[PDB]
Design a protein around this ligand. Structure first.
Ligand code: ZN
Lengths: 409, 224, 226
């Protein structure tokens, strides 16, 4: 007999006679949870020689099997805007599927493209009414107070002045001043003469982490997509000017009374990795849930290279479609660092909610992929959501009767 | 001309122009030849998209219909009526076709199940758009006749059987409000296949697992 | 009424079926009032997808027509069956863009887009004809952009999406239809770079459409240079 280390935190004793190969013996047990000999992979200890499916198991008695997971092509003509999913260009015709949701490429003459359809701040002391500090976080301390109203000031950790560092902030505050947006919080100003209590707008409303674990109230999943879209759009604009968040958490995110999400309390890669001279070499901070595998490694000289924020978004998708944080079973800060950066551990995706579209479950297969070379930039991630944000009344039924492959390889 | 009706339907298959397969194949079923597996399949692929895409068109119009002066509602309500009548006429086209020449000349045991499966299937779309009791009970009786023929002739590891099991099961949950009947139907059909997975063919392996996958994906979904 | 036609258009847009809206919007063009921007792109999208549906229909059947003798005739006859449908609908909207909305207008940029459509749809008809049957259309299309394109480089800033929209469409007009990449390459780089120096003010006029077309220029050029 042989073991199996199933995803979804399960394990089932299974038999293994002679002659029968890998495929059927496991498939008789693999299928009970929705697998197939061509969507999974297992490895043996030697240190992981790939044990496929054709191979004979006559020499695999008393063994351990971690079954770690690795379509039918209807046609359509994408009326609304919709991007490809093999090169992430703009796609007009092409294949699809009723369940997966994944487009496919069509030239692998090569027709051209067309136009897609459509639809300074000086602040002196005197108005600074600073109150109790909220708490620590990603890059330091925050202070709820009052400046021209209920506006959240924010005092950094390393407030040690450097006359050239203020110029660096002038480089990082001027860029991060005029970028207004529907979602992003309207930044106000900076405390100049007193120590830097950044004047970032404060309002009412509950946070996302506050909304899911302190009270832990969920709604109808129609609103769930609303959260995964506006935060894909609000943070899309930040990457439109290359302004990475660098601290995307389920904490700073706000909700404007079930109307629209609001993102903020971000930026300032100068105070982070403070000037020890003329250098700003970076460091890890806060927690490593939102932060990315190639930021864990400490060897990313520019960690937020337009993709480390994509992984931060995904760790918000997982908090959206599971109601629980990642790694509620491993609760040690120092050790999870070792097992996430080197690639030994990735969030267990086979525990996600059951009543969510397969397309977004495919979105997390890329928006949470450990590599930074195949993350879909927020341009593509933004567009994908409206595709299945208006496609709610289309696949809401029970997995009925699908057609055949309709495509030949 | 029947083969001339073939090329004009397979070509229309990959054109997003399916109303040309409604015309072509409906004119093949009303000839009097033998419905081979290929043209049998194209009939299912043609109408399903023609009625399913129009069915799914109704659902989106339905969601906005319930999301509310009455001027906005009456316009959405009117469009709901317009697609509704098109749905019945594009489904009764199949329903009348089913009476005329399809079933009474069924040649094979597995074949008649395929049509008998479709009978109830096309009633289901008509049933859920609806005056009401007469349509829904006929569907079930059409399904029940498919049920009767299925268990005693249809193999337990065949896509049609599973698809009929799938459809008949999802019929219970959505229209007949009997999930316990559905999950029992799904589990029973699914389990026997798991015992029979050791014996199949590559020509039946592909579509079979997809239905079971959805059927198992259906199994997990209704558990809660 | 008028808003009932407009409202029905939006509802038809909802359900993946724009043929119903196109016949409803084609009535909107035949009203006689001043078309406005919000439903103006509804005019653009309506026939674009309706034609695109037939374009996708023609583009695939053309492939199997060349991928082949009675069977070839079946493809040959059907291909012309949809080209007439493709041409008739294009002629239906070409009548729209000629005798209906070009005369009544008072804002240059509003005239720019419709003139872009005139060059667009004439170009669309130019994709199906051959030899002599297209010269009267291609020349008509070229003037529609040239009239608008001169208004583009003069009367509107490079940030506005339509000028880039007029740029990307007009450039490909040279490569595929007119087979003149050199004027396309020069215009593409010019339109993109003259629009890359003034990207400071975006949110006041949706940044979305800009970067898509802006990106759609470089990657197109990446193909246009290889
Ligand atoms: Zn592609």
């Amino acid at each position: 007999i042989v073991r199996v280390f199933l995803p979804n935190k399960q394990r089932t004793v299974v038999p293994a006679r002679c002659g029968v190969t890998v495929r059927d013996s496991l498939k008789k047990a693999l299928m009970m949870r929705g697998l197939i000999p061509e969507c999974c992979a297992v490895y043996r200890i030697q240190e992981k020689k790939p044990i496929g499916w054709d191979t004979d198991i006559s020499w695999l008695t008393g063994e351990e099997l971690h079954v770690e997971v690795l379509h039918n092509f209807v046609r359509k003509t994408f009326f609304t805007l919709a991007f490809c999913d093999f090169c992430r260009k703009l796609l007009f015709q092409g294949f699809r599927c009723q369940t997966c949701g994944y487009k496919f490429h069509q030239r692998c003459r090569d027709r051209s493209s067309s136009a897609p359809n459509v639809h300074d701040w000086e602040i002196p002391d005197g108005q600074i009414t600073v109150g109790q500090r909220i708490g620590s976080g990603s890059f330091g301390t925050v202070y709820k107070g009052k400046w021209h109203g209920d506006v959240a000031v924010k005092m950094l950790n390393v407030t040690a002045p450097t006359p050239q560092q203020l110029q660096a902030f002038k480089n990082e505050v001027g860029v991060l001043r005029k970028t207004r947006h529907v979602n992003i919080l309207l930044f106000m100003g900076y405390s100049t003469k007193p120590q830097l209590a950044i004047v970032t707008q404060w309002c009412e409303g509950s946070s996302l982490y506050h909304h899911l674990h302190i009270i832990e109230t969920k709604f109808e999943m129609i609103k769930l997509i609303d959260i995964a879209r506006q935060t894909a759009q609000g943070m899309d604009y930040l990457h439109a000017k290359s302004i990475i968040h660098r601290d995307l958490k389920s904490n700073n995110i706000f909700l404007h009374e079930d109307l629209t999400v609001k993102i903020g309390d971000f930026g300032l890669a100068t105070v982070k990795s403070r000037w020890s001279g003329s250098h700003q070499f970076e460091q890890l901070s806060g927690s490593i849930l939102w932060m990315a595998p190639e930021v864990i490694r400490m060897q990313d000289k520019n960690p937020y290279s337009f993709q480390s924020d994509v992984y931060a978004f995904g760790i918000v998708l997982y908090e959206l479609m599971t109601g629980q944080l990642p790694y509620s079973n491993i609760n040690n800060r120092d050790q999870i660092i070792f097992m996430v950066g080197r690639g030994y551990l990735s969030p267990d995706l086979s525990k996600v909610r059951s009543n969510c579209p397969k397309a977004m479950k495919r979105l997390m297969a890329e928006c949470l992929k450990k590599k930074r070379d195949e993350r879909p930039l927020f341009p593509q991630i933004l567009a994908s959501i409206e595709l299945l944000a208006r496609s709610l009344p289309k696949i809401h039924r029970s997995a009925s009767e699908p057609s055949l492959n309709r495509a030949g390889f | 001309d029947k083969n001339e009706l073939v090329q004009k339907a397979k070509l229309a298959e990959q054109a997003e122009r399916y109303d040309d397969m409604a015309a072509c194949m409906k004119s093949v079923t009303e000839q009097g030849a033998e419905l081979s597996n290929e043209e049998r399949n194209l009939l299912s692929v043609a109408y399903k998209n023609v009625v399913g895409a129009r069915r799914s068109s109704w659902r989106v119009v339905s969601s906005i219909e319930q999301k509310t002066a009455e001027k906005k509602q009456q316009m959405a309500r009117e469009y709901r009526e317009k697609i509704e009548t098109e749905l019945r006429d594009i489904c009764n086209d199949v329903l009348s076709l089913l009476e005329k020449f399809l079933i009474p000349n069924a040649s094979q045991a597995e074949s008649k199940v395929f049509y008998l499966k479709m009978k109830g299937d096309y009633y289901r779309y008509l049933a859920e758009v609806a005056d009401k009791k007469g349509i829904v009970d006929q569907s079930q009786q059409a399904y029940q006749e498919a049920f009767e023929i299925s268990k005693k002739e249809m193999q337990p590891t065949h896509p049609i059987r599973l698809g009929l099991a799938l459809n008949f099961s999802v019929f219970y949950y959505e229209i007949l409000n009997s999930p316990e009947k559905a999950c029992s139907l799904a589990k029973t059909a699914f389990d026997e296949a798991i015992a029979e997975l050791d014996t199949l063919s590559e020509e039946s392996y592909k579509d079979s697992t997809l239905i079971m996958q959805l059927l198992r994906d259906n199994l997990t979904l209704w558990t809660s």
